[PDB]
Design a protein around this ligand. Structure first.
Ligand SMILES: Nc1ncnc2c1ncn2[C@@H]1O[C@H](COP(=O)(O)OP(=O)(O)O)[C@@H](O)[C@H]1O
Ligand SMILES: Nc1ncnc2c1ncn2[C@@H]1O[C@H](COP(=O)(O)OP(=O)(O)O)[C@@H](O)[C@H]1O
Ligand SMILES: [Mg+2]
Ligand SMILES: [Mg+2]
Lengths: 154, 536, 260, 52, 116, 150
């Protein structure tokens, strides 16, 4: 879990898989946004804050209990996720994203606006596992409905 | 190597102590042949044929390559005396090495260095007190002649020595010109504000003292006049070039018709600035920055002199002397861009004079302040370079005399008097310090001995006669006039050096004793050396 | 090595330790409150104990080297052309915009300098600034024309020491620059050391709060280094005496008593 | 230099016992600031007795 | 110039960040370091990657938050400012990667972040 | 900022507080006059001041930020009479959260949804020749600092 203070165990988790970093939108093409007045600066700041709040609210509206991203995210999104009781994990690899989507029965959503309740995966238990005196942590997703993927932990 | 296990060499006891004395003595022996009027200059080759003919002690040690740390202490000691006094640089190195050499002899006799250091410190403190109480002559009783005599004394042993009759007047006049008073009413003489220009050519007699300032610069353009009678000098600290916008400003053209006007302003802005300066009547424009060709034409058409690339320190002296004001920018407190006549310096003449196939600017007779500059002529640059160093010493000597109005007799008079007094005073202080203080007195005799040796005369006999004269002075209350007896190297006999006009600033002898004692104490405090091998 | 100078250094060290602590309450001494400044030249006899603040920086002003009844003010922003943290450019499309930009930049600098001067400040310390010109030459010219001593390139690590010494609260935006932010002092003067360097000394402060500076001078580098080390040893000994109020005889007495 | 901590720090001692003595000098300087030579002399004498 | 010179060991590469506010440096011990140009403080040192780093690449589309470092560990591993963690790593390289070019990024083998 | 706080109200944060720029990295300031540039600079400073005011509205005595705190927020906190500790690394902020009970925050639009750490006294102490910040009378104390002298 990204934030150190989120709970280490989630039961009956409604999993939301996302591949959009929880950051303000960025066009792929070479883009320059011109600020020509103080009002433009205020509008841009409000746009940033509202983008963060809106993306978090969109994630929350689907009823998800746990969100998984692939490209990480920044401090404001992390604290909003913690504040709204939304445990989350970031920088999950592509193959791991595919495995989670297959096992939990949920789809992969490329942006928040396309996130619906029917695209949420389900897991009976999501847990963080310690490994003794090593500071290393690993996430465990299991107790799925009809999981078509398995993991052998040696 | 052994149980210590340190990757380097080590020396302890008399082995390192002798090396430190040997290293210190090596530096002194280099410059012992350049002391006194019968001293001789030295020639230094800089491994690429660069020749430096010099007699200054600091200059010799600056160019020398020294490896031993003890030698480096003496070499840096010469620099400290040069910076903080300006004269007596050769004396302090010789005295310090002699102090350390004699101190080691006591140490070899199982006298603890702490006792030797204690004796040296007491002797140095009492030597200064004795000098300030019995060997100082107030310059107010002598008038202008003491300054000339003090300047002439410093010029002896230098390449401008015999011509000192003509050179002393120029130095004294130069220093008196730049004199100014400050807060609390202390007349201070900012020596090194007298610009010194070197140019080979005519004999040394033809060296000129400019009643103004001399610039090592030429006019920007040939079309401009090379002489202004009533100069209105304007000093600027910015370049006069085509205007170019800063880093955060870009020119983006959407309507093509706006391109020509914008390019016009790149040159019209500077023209407006120049016209504002010219409109107030300025004749001479000196700037630290560059001037473009199209900017020079405005001065050409107006018949005004314009000098570019002026050194910043030169501009400050000209502005102060002429009463002008340095303007880093044209901007008033009202947000406009203006130039007022109040920032114009004035001079009685500005000439593009010619000096031996070259040319230079002479700002003659500036008003509201008197300045001075000296142009030195010689056979070649080697001769001219040494004249500047010798002249700098004479300028420093006159500065100390005018600030501190006390002088001391020269030619070893002070050292001979101190040796007699210190050796008598040693018997009334301590038991182990008696030898240390007495050895301090003997070490001071290295100066009169070195003067006599340089003249190929009987150093043993002359010092004995010189010491005998001073001995009678301290024991006979009616023979106190013998304190001024020093050395006359021309005839090789003792002579009253106060009557002979051989004077030195009191600060030169006092600072020499304090600095040499501390330098000698520092080396004497060592008894073990660890030299770590280079990491390469 | 400084044994003949002990009659001067020992009272200096005792005063330096006492000046930075409260004798009735202190249980430890922070030697970082005693700044040691090493300047070549002179003799160890010239070592001085400065009550105020000594800065090695050079005054950018020319002709203004002494200020009486100074009002020092720390500046943590830059006196240059405006430059936002974002990427900023000024686009020029007409000839009039050129001199409009020039005039507006001049007006902005003049407004900053006028705001600084209106508080009564006469000595200005400018924190060292990278990525932006701390002191533009035009701003320097305006500051000089208003008779304000300017010292720039102040190190970022000396801000706390300066504030503790002269009682100045640093200012990072021109809006908050007011009279109360200034640290009143009796004298701010730059003095040369017998033609061997220059030192800026601000001696005499209305709030001399537990801070002192020691200026160490000597003939050569090595003796200055050992003067500093020996002064530090004396300060450490007084610090030990502060920590543990107990004294014991020296000269090998404790070791012989211990052996017996 | 006469300071024990500076003397031991400047010279590049290689044997581990000498390195420990240098660190001991540093610790004594940190806690006290004086007696830096005395503590090293005491440690050396202690180990010399430990030999016998 | 910055001329900070706070470093115990030599600098294999001193890559100025795309954001004109801070620099990214990697010492000879294999640990990258981030410095603020204005303040001068070391924001955070990145552990791991025992052998010395040899190339530093910031994100190309500004985004001064992620970078990739490679050295003698035959590794291509990606960091993140906002967490100070190795978010992604690669194993294909087998010999002392000299220079790395950011496209995904090509190092000398073209890696793809979207598929590892 | 003050060097001693009694009955502290800790607020642990992980915000910028250092030339805080909008994460729209394609944005730039493009105007035709330096007056507009000065206005934009004042707007940026006003944004930072509003950020500091939002932080202060929590009603706190102390403020620990994981990242750096620049000079302007530093003087704002000093004028507010709030002790601000900067550059407390991830482990540092985690340990303070564990020992005081505070929540590591990154947005301050909801003061009532963020809990604040508490301790009896904060002061500066000398350990050898270094000065450290001491948290005394902590609330939870599920984080220890062991000092080793050798
Ligand atoms: N006309 C003179 N007659 C006798 N002695 C002189 C005369 N001029 C100088 N001296 C002495 O010669 C000594 C050497 O001075 P010098 O070496 O030229 O100075 P520096 O040591 O700065 O080079 C001085 O101490 C001075 O007393
Ligand atoms: N005037 C003195 N007379 C006798 N013993 C002294 C005197 N001054 C210092 N000592 C002794 O010399 C020892 C060494 O002190 P010092 O060299 O100053 O520092 P360190 O203890 O670090 O070597 C001390 O233990 C002290 O007892
Ligand atoms: Mg001479
Ligand atoms: Mg001691």
């Amino acid at each position: 879990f990204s934030h150190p203070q989120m709970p280490k165990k989630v039961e009956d988790a409604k999993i939301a898989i996302l591949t959009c970093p929880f950051e303000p939108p960025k066009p792929k093409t070479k883009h320059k946004l011109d600020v020509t007045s103080v009002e433009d600066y205020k509008a841009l700041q409000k746009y940033e804050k509202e983008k963060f709040e809106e993306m978090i609210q969109q994630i929350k509206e689907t009823g998800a209990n746990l969100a998984i991203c692939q490209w990480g995210f920044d401090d404001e999104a992390n604290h909003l996720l913690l504040q709204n009781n939304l445990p989350a994990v970031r920088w999950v690899g592509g193959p791991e994203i595919e495995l989670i989507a297959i096992a939990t029965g949920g789809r992969i959503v490329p942006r928040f606006s396309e996130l619906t309740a029917e695209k949420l995966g389900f897991a009976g238990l999501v847990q963080e596992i310690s490994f003794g005196t090593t500071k290393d942590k690993m996430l465990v997703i299991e107790q799925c409905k009809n999981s078509r993927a398995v993991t052998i932990f040696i | 190597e052994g149980p210590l296990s340190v990757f380097g060499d080590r020396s302890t006891g008399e082995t390192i102590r002798s090396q430190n004395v040997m290293a210190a003595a090596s530096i002194a022996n280099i410059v012992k042949s350049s002391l006194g009027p019968v001293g001789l200059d030295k020639m230094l080759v800089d491994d690429i044929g660069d020749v430096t003919i010099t007699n200054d002690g600091a200059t010799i040690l600056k160019l020398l390559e020294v490896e031993h740390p003890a030698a480096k202490v003496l070499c840096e000691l010469a620099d400290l005396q040069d910076k903080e006094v300006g004269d007596g640089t050769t004396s302090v190195v010789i005295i310090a090495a002699e102090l350390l050499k004699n101190a080691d002899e006591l140490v070899k006799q199982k006298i603890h260095p702490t006792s030797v250091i204690s004796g040296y410190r007491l002797a140095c403190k009492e030597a200064v007190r004795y000098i300030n109480e019995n060997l100082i002559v107030n310059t107010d009783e002598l008038g202008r002649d003491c300054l000339i005599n003090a300047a002439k004394t410093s010029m002896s042993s230098k390449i401008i020595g015999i011509n000192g009759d003509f050179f002393a007047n120029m130095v004294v006049d130069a220093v008196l010109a730049i004199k100014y008073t400050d807060i609390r009413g202390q007349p201070r003489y900012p020596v090194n504000s007298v610009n010194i220009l070197k140019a080979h050519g005519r004999s040394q007699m033809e060296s000129m003292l400019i009643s103004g300032y001399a610039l090592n610069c030429v006019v920007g353009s040939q079309g401009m006049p090379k002489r202004i009678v009533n100069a209105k000098i304007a000093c600027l600290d910015f370049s006069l070039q085509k205007t170019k916008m800063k880093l955060g400003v870009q020119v983006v053209i959407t309507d093509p018709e706006k391109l020509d006007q914008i390019r016009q302003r790149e040159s019209d802005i500077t023209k407006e600035r120049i016209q504002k300066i010219l409109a107030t009547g300025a004749n001479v424009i000196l700037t630290t920055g560059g001037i473009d060709d199209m900017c020079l034409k405005y001065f050409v058409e107006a018949g005004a002199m314009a000098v570019r690339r002026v050194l910043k320190r030169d501009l400050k002296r000209i502005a102060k002397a002429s009463g002008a004001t340095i303007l880093s920018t044209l901007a008033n407190l009202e947000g406009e861009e203006t130039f007022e006549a109040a920032m114009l310096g004035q001079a009685e003449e500005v000439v593009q004079e010619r000096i031996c196939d070259d040319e230079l600017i002479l700002i003659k007779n500036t008003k509201a302040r008197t300045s001075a500059s000296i142009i030195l002529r010689g056979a070649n640059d080697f001769m001219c370079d040494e004249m500047e160093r010798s002249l700098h010493d004479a300028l420093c000597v006159v500065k100390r005399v005018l600030e501190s109005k006390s002088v001391v007799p020269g030619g070893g008079a002070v050292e001979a008097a101190l040796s007699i007094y210190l050796e008598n005073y040693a018997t009334s202080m301590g038991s182990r310090e008696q030898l240390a203080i007495a050895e301090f007195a003997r070490s001071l005799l290295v100066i009169p001995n070195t003067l006599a040796v340089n003249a190929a005369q009987d150093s043993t006999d002359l010092v004995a006669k010189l010491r005998a004269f001073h001995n009678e002075a301290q024991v006979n209350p009616e023979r106190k006039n013998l304190k001024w007896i020093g050395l006359d190297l021309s005839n090789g006999k003792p002579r009253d050096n106060k009557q002979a006009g051989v004077f030195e600033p009191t600060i030169v002898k006092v600072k020499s004793l304090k600095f040499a004692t501390e330098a000698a104490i520092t080396i004497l405090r060592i008894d073990d050396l660890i030299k770590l091998h280079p990491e390469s | 090595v400084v044994s003949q100078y002990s009659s001067l250094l020992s009272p200096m060290s005792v005063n330096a330790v006492m000046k930075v602590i409260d004798p009735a309450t202190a249980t430890s001494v922070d030697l970082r409150d005693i700044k040691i400044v090493k300047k070549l030249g002179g003799t160890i006899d010239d070592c001085e104990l400065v009550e105020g603040l000594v800065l090695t920086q050079k005054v950018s002003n020319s002709g203004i080297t002494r200020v009486e009844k100074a009002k020092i003010g720390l500046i943590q922003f830059c006196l240059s052309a405006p430059k936002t943290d974002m990427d900023n450019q000024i686009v020029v499309s007409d000839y009039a915009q050129m001199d409009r930009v020039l005039r507006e930049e001049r007006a902005y600098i003049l407004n900053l300098v006028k705001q600084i001067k209106k508080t009564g400040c006469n000595v200005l310390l400018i924190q060292k600034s990278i990525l932006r010109d701390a002191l533009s030459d035009l701003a320097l010219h305006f500051l000089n024309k208003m008779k304000i001593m300017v010292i720039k390139d102040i190190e970022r690590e000396d801000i706390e020491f300066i504030c503790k010494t002269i009682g100045t609260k640093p200012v990072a935006h021109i809006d908050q620059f007011t009279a109360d932010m200034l640290g009143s002092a009796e004298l701010a003067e730059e003095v040369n050391l017998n033609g061997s360097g220059k030192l800026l000394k601000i001696t005499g402060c209305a709030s001399p709060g537990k801070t002192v500076t020691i200026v160490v001078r000597g003939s050569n580098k090595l003796v200055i280094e050992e003067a500093e080390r020996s002064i530090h040893d004396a300060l450490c000994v007084i610090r030990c005496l502060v920590k543990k109020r107990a004294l014991i005889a020296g000269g090998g007495a404790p070791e012989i008593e211990l052996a017996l | 230099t006469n300071d024990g901590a500076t003397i031991l720090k400047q010279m590049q001692v290689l044997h581990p016992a000498a390195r420990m003595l240098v660190e001991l000098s540093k610790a004594q300087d940190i806690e006290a600031g004086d007696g830096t030579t005395s503590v090293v002399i005491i440690a050396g004498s202690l180990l010399d007795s430990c030999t016998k | 110039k910055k001329s900070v010179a706070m470093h115990t060991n030599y600098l294999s590469a001193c890559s100025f960040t795309n954001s004109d506010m801070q620099i990214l440096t990697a010492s000879g011990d294999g640990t990258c370091a981030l410095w603020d140009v204005e303040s001068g403080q070391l924001l955070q040192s990145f552990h791991g990657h025992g052998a010395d780093v040899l190339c530093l690449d910031l994100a190309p589309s500004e985004t001064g938050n992620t970078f990739v470092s490679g050295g003698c560990d035959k590794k291509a591993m990606v960091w993140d400012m906002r967490s100070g963690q190795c978010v992604q790593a690669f194993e294909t390289h087998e010999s002392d990667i000299n220079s790395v070019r950011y496209y995904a990024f090509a190092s000398g083998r073209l890696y793809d972040l979207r598929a590892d | 900022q003050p060097k001693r706080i009694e009955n502290a109200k800790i607020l642990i944060a992980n915000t910028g507080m250092d030339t805080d720029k909008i994460k729209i990295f394609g944005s730039r300031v493009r105007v035709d006059s330096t007056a507009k540039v000065a206005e934009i600079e004042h707007a940026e400073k006003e944004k930072m001041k509003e950020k500091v005011e939002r932080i202060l509205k929590h009603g706190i005595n102390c403020f620990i930020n994981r990242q750096l705190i620049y000079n302007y927020p530093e003087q704002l906190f000093g004028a507010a009479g709030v002790m601000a500790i900067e550059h407390a690394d991830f482990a540092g902020v985690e340990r303070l959260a564990l020992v005081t009970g505070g929540e590591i925050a990154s947005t301050f639009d909801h003061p009532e949804l963020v809990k604040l750490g508490s301790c009896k006294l904060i002061e500066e102490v000398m350990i050898g020749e270094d000065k450290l910040i001491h948290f005394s009378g902590v609330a939870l104390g599920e984080a220890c600092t062991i000092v080793l002298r050798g």
